[PDB]
């Protein structure tokens, strides 16, 4: 009835992200690239604004919603927070995988958000 706990939401997110990335043949997006970010705490928020730059990819539309659950502040294609540094862009396939390592990482510390 009430929302799912933080630890449960994370596992459901990791299991879903892995599932769509294991049977994926070619890149989910047309080789779209995203800005690299620093994986620390506000990863969900920093990661969200980076995905907001990817359009035309429904396979990740649901992902943006689940990420928002950990980041209540919405981001428009005009408002940016972590894209202040001039980092290089990377393929989404790598962005999802790099994020996967950090997602299960916080599970070990049980420190969600």
UniProtKB/Swiss-Prot annotation:
Cysteine pairings via disulfide bonds: 29-57, 45-71
Source superkingdom: Eukaryota
Major place of residence: secreted
Compartment(s) where it occurs, according to its Swiss-Prot or TrEMBL record: Secreted
A Gene Ontology BP annotation from the UniProt entry: positive regulation of cold-induced thermogenesis
Entry's Gene Ontology molecular function annotations: cytokine activity; interleukin-13 receptor binding
Glycan-modified residues: 19, 30, 38, 53
Keywords associated with the record: Cytokine, Disulfide bond, Glycoprotein, Secreted, Signal
A GO CC annotation given for this chain: cytoplasm
Subunit details: Interacts with IL13RA2.
Function in brief: Cytokine that plays important roles in allergic inflammation and immune response to parasite infection. Synergizes with IL2 in regulating interferon-gamma synthesis. Stimulates B-cell proliferation, and activation of eosinophils, basophils, and mast cells. Plays an important role in controlling IL33 activity by modulating the production of transmembrane and soluble forms of interleukin-1 receptor-like 1/IL1RL1.
Noted disease: Allergic rhinitis: A common disease with complex inheritance characterized by mucosal inflammation caused by allergen exposure.
Family as reported in the entry's similarity comment: Belongs to the IL-4/IL-13 family.
Protein name per the record: Interleukin-13
Species assigned in the record: Homo sapiens (Human)
Phylogenetic placement of the source organism: Eukaryota, Metazoa, Chordata, Craniata, Vertebrata
């Amino acid at each position: 009835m009430g929302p799912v706990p933080p630890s449960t939401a994370l596992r459901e997110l990791i299991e879903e992200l892995v599932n769509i990335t294991q049977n994926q043949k070619a890149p989910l997006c047309n080789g779209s690239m995203v800005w690299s970010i620093n994986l620390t705490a506000g990863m969900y928020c920093a990661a969200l604004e980076s995905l907001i730059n990817v359009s035309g990819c429904s396979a990740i539309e649901k992902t943006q919603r689940m990420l928002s659950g950990f980041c209540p502040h919405k981001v428009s294609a005009g408002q940016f927070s972590s894209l202040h540094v001039r980092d290089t862009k990377i393929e989404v396939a790598q962005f999802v995988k790099d994020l996967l390592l950090h997602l299960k990482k916080l599970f070990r510390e049980g420190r969600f958000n």
